[PDB]
mmCIF file of C-alpha atoms in Angstrom:
data_model
loop_
_atom_site.group_PDB
_atom_site.id
_atom_site.type_symbol
_atom_site.label_atom_id
_atom_site.label_comp_id
_atom_site.label_asym_id
_atom_site.label_seq_id
_atom_site.Cartn_x
_atom_site.Cartn_y
_atom_site.Cartn_z
ATOM 1 C CA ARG X 1 -67.018 76.457 -24.346
ATOM 2 C CA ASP X 2 -63.688 77.366 -26.260
ATOM 3 C CA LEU X 3 -62.309 80.662 -24.667
ATOM 4 C CA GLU X 4 -64.647 80.402 -21.510
ATOM 5 C CA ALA X 5 -63.525 76.770 -21.123
ATOM 6 C CA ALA X 6 -59.567 77.689 -21.577
ATOM 7 C CA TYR X 7 -59.988 80.419 -18.955
ATOM 8 C CA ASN X 8 -61.589 78.094 -16.582
ATOM 9 C CA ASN X 9 -58.895 75.524 -17.066
ATOM 10 C CA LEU X 10 -56.355 78.368 -16.480
ATOM 11 C CA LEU X 11 -57.958 79.349 -13.327
ATOM 12 C CA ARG X 12 -57.686 75.546 -12.052
ATOM 13 C CA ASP X 13 -53.933 75.291 -12.889
ATOM 14 C CA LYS X 14 -53.253 78.746 -11.271
ATOM 15 C CA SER X 15 -54.864 77.385 -8.156
ATOM 16 C CA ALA X 16 -52.813 74.179 -8.282
ATOM 17 C CA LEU X 17 -49.670 76.226 -8.822
ATOM 18 C CA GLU X 18 -50.510 78.736 -5.933
ATOM 19 C CA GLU X 19 -50.902 75.765 -3.553
ATOM 20 C CA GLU X 20 -47.493 74.342 -4.675
ATOM 21 C CA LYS X 21 -45.855 77.633 -4.091
ATOM 22 C CA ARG X 22 -47.398 77.882 -0.698
ATOM 23 C CA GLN X 23 -46.097 74.417 0.338
ATOM 24 C CA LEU X 24 -42.679 75.445 -0.875
ATOM 25 C CA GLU X 25 -42.684 78.826 0.827
ATOM 26 C CA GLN X 26 -43.664 77.228 4.030
ATOM 27 C CA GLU X 27 -40.870 74.579 3.867
ATOM 28 C CA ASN X 28 -38.275 76.901 2.720
ATOM 29 C CA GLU X 29 -38.718 79.328 5.708
ATOM 30 C CA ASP X 30 -38.619 76.270 8.110
ATOM 31 C CA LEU X 31 -35.351 75.250 6.501
ATOM 32 C CA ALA X 32 -33.928 78.705 6.516
ATOM 33 C CA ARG X 33 -34.909 79.093 10.280
ATOM 34 C CA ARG X 34 -33.368 75.611 10.953
ATOM 35 C CA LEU X 35 -30.126 76.516 9.283
ATOM 36 C CA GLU X 36 -29.741 79.783 11.185
ATOM 37 C CA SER X 37 -30.265 77.995 14.273
ATOM 38 C CA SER X 38 -27.753 75.466 13.374
ATOM 39 C CA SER X 39 -25.370 78.235 12.352
ATOM 40 C CA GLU X 40 -25.910 79.888 15.737
ATOM 41 C CA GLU X 41 -25.131 76.576 17.549
ATOM 42 C CA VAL X 42 -21.872 76.108 15.313
ATOM 43 C CA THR X 43 -20.553 79.832 16.348
ATOM 44 C CA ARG X 44 -21.687 79.266 20.095
ATOM 45 C CA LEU X 45 -19.729 75.859 20.384
ATOM 46 C CA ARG X 46 -16.660 77.232 18.589
ATOM 47 C CA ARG X 47 -16.626 80.395 20.986
ATOM 48 C CA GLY X 48 -16.458 77.988 23.833
ATOM 49 C CA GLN X 49 -14.371 75.363 22.378
ATOM 50 C CA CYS X 50 -12.085 76.444 19.673
ATOM 51 C CA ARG Z 1 -61.479 92.998 -23.761
ATOM 52 C CA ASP Z 2 -63.136 91.629 -20.619
ATOM 53 C CA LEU Z 3 -62.734 87.819 -21.229
ATOM 54 C CA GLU Z 4 -59.838 88.250 -23.679
ATOM 55 C CA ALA Z 5 -58.000 90.349 -21.052
ATOM 56 C CA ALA Z 6 -58.870 88.187 -18.250
ATOM 57 C CA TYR Z 7 -57.568 85.191 -20.024
ATOM 58 C CA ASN Z 8 -54.279 86.863 -20.938
ATOM 59 C CA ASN Z 9 -53.720 88.059 -17.301
ATOM 60 C CA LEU Z 10 -53.935 84.461 -16.163
ATOM 61 C CA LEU Z 11 -51.563 83.475 -19.111
ATOM 62 C CA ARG Z 12 -49.075 86.032 -17.209
ATOM 63 C CA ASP Z 13 -49.637 84.723 -13.887
ATOM 64 C CA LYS Z 14 -49.172 81.089 -14.779
ATOM 65 C CA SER Z 15 -45.849 81.896 -16.389
ATOM 66 C CA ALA Z 16 -44.827 84.055 -13.403
ATOM 67 C CA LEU Z 17 -45.960 81.199 -10.911
ATOM 68 C CA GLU Z 18 -44.102 78.580 -12.901
ATOM 69 C CA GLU Z 19 -40.907 80.586 -12.691
ATOM 70 C CA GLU Z 20 -41.416 81.284 -8.957
ATOM 71 C CA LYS Z 21 -41.878 77.650 -8.224
ATOM 72 C CA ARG Z 22 -38.726 76.708 -10.042
ATOM 73 C CA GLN Z 23 -36.807 79.461 -8.138
ATOM 74 C CA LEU Z 24 -38.394 78.063 -4.712
ATOM 75 C CA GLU Z 25 -37.344 74.533 -5.617
ATOM 76 C CA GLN Z 26 -33.726 75.811 -6.412
ATOM 77 C CA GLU Z 27 -33.640 77.552 -2.894
ATOM 78 C CA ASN Z 28 -35.133 74.468 -1.196
ATOM 79 C CA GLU Z 29 -32.369 72.348 -2.473
ATOM 80 C CA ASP Z 30 -29.616 74.933 -1.764
ATOM 81 C CA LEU Z 31 -31.032 75.461 2.093
ATOM 82 C CA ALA Z 32 -31.214 71.675 2.654
ATOM 83 C CA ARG Z 33 -27.496 71.276 1.544
ATOM 84 C CA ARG Z 34 -26.382 74.013 3.768
ATOM 85 C CA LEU Z 35 -28.350 72.579 6.608
ATOM 86 C CA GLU Z 36 -26.729 69.286 6.175
ATOM 87 C CA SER Z 37 -23.250 70.839 6.186
ATOM 88 C CA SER Z 38 -24.071 72.767 9.344
ATOM 89 C CA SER Z 39 -25.393 69.791 11.062
ATOM 90 C CA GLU Z 40 -22.153 67.941 10.183
ATOM 91 C CA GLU Z 41 -20.162 70.732 11.673
ATOM 92 C CA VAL Z 42 -22.093 70.593 14.940
ATOM 93 C CA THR Z 43 -21.650 66.898 15.253
ATOM 94 C CA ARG Z 44 -17.681 67.213 14.688
ATOM 95 C CA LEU Z 45 -17.667 70.095 17.398
ATOM 96 C CA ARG Z 46 -19.773 67.921 19.858
ATOM 97 C CA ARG Z 47 -17.042 65.326 19.560
ATOM 98 C CA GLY Z 48 -14.247 67.794 20.070
ATOM 99 C CA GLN Z 49 -13.064 68.302 16.447
ATOM 100 C CA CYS Z 50 -12.683 72.165 15.746
#
């Protein structure tokens, strides 16, 4: 199936990478939100304590 | 080029996805590091260390 097959094997790889990308985006946005929340806690504490 | 063009478009997509995944992995590690630093600063502040 040479060229047909090679195309279908690339479709499968692309789907695999797209899923990995989706996982990393979801995890990075969670980390980014938690960082900003931690940063806001730092400045809030410092405003009241330092 | 129907099949030939579709194949080459996928070659391009795969190459772009691999680079986006590496970028995302880099930013994942950077976010985790910054989040860990922030969390330690919150801990210091909560025990009175400005």
